[PDB]
Amino acid sequence: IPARLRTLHNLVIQYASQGRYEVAVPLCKQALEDLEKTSGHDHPDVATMLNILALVYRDQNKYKDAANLLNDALAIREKTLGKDHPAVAATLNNLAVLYGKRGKYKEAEPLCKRALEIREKVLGKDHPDVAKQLNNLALLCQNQGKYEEVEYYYQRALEIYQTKLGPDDPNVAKTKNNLASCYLKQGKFKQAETLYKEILTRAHEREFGS
């Protein structure tokens, strides 16, 4: 991300995190206006700026306002960076999240799957950004009740995370809790209780010393 933009990012998110949207929002909109003046609309820095203001709106739960901006950012990024660029998968995942926040889980799912395929096609089927996207897809299938698909995506992500980061990785514990719940939802008690035992024991192990 360009340097003068992330400084603005830090400043605006600081304001947002104090609930001071009356300052965060004008700063983003003016910065967007001034960016457009310098480089015209179809420029990566404009998409980046739109993503910052979409985050601020999301932080206020203005979900449809945020999607409008990211839909604009997505078209910019596809034209300027390409249909398979990682930033396009980033913008697709955020749109999947915003549609899901409006109960529009059937619109969300293609967007999230595309972001997954983009990340596999760039980072390889084993990258942990793929696991992260898998966790995001799993959560969306859960809100549609597709528990066999949830369990598949969580297993894939647990395997990426645990074979590629530590067994003591925050995400490994996070993905194990998610999958454990999903087993219990399905009635697969002995699979659910196998995972729960691991979580407890490893937690006890972490606090205890050598």
Residue numbers in the entry: 209 to 418
Authors' description from the paper:
Kinesin1 functions as a hetero-tetramer composed of a dimer of kinesin heavy chains (KHC) bound to two kinesin light chains (KLC). KLC is also composed of three regions: a N-terminal Heptad Repeat (HR) region that binds to the KHC stalk, a TPR (Tetratrico Peptide Repeat) domain involved in cargo recruitment, and a variable C-terminal region. The TPR domain of KLC1/2 belongs to the 42PR motif family and consists of six TPR motifs (TPR1-6) with a non-TPR region of 40 residues inserted between TPR5 and TPR6 motifs. The N-terminal capping A1 helix exhibits structural plasticity adopting two distinct and defined orientations relative to the rest of the TPR domain.
In order to visualise the structure of KLC1-TPR domain without this unnatural ligand bound, we created a new fragment of KLC1 that differs in its N-terminal His-tag linker sequence. Due to difficulties in crystallization, this fragment lacks the non-TPR region and the TPR6 motif. The structure of KLC1-TPR[A1-B5] is composed of 10 α-helices (namely A1 to B5 helices) adopting the common KLC-TPR structural motif. However, in the crystal, the KLC1-TPR[A1-B5] molecule makes a tight interaction with one of its symmetrical counterparts. Through a 2-fold axis, both C-terminal helices (αB5) bind into the N-terminal part of the groove of the related molecule, covering a total buried surface area of 3196 Å2. The N-terminal part of the TPR domain consisting of A1, A2, B2 and A3 helices makes extensive hydrophilic and hydrophobic interactions with the B5’ helix (K405’-F416’), as well as with the last two extreme C-terminus residues (G417’-S418’) from the symmetrical molecule (hereafter denoted by an apostrophe). The phenylalanine residue, Phe416’, located at the end of αB5’, is fully buried within a hydrophobic pocket formed at the interface of αA2 and αA3 (αA2/αA3 pocket) and composed of residues Asn259, Ala262, Leu263, Arg266 from αA2, Ala274 and Leu278 from αB2, Asn302, Val305 and Leu306 from αA3. Specially, the side-chain of Phe416’ occupies the same hydrophobic αA2/αA3 pocket as the Trp207 from SKIP-WD motif. The TPR domain closure of KLC1-TPR[A1-B5] is certainly the consequence of the tight crystal contact that drives the C-terminus of the B5’ helix to lie into the groove with Phe416’ occupying the αA2/αA3 pocket. In KLC1-TPR[A1-B5] structure (this study, “IN” αA1), no hydrophobic pocket is found at the αA1/αA2 interface and residues Pro210 and Leu213 from the αA1, as well as Ile209, occupy this space.
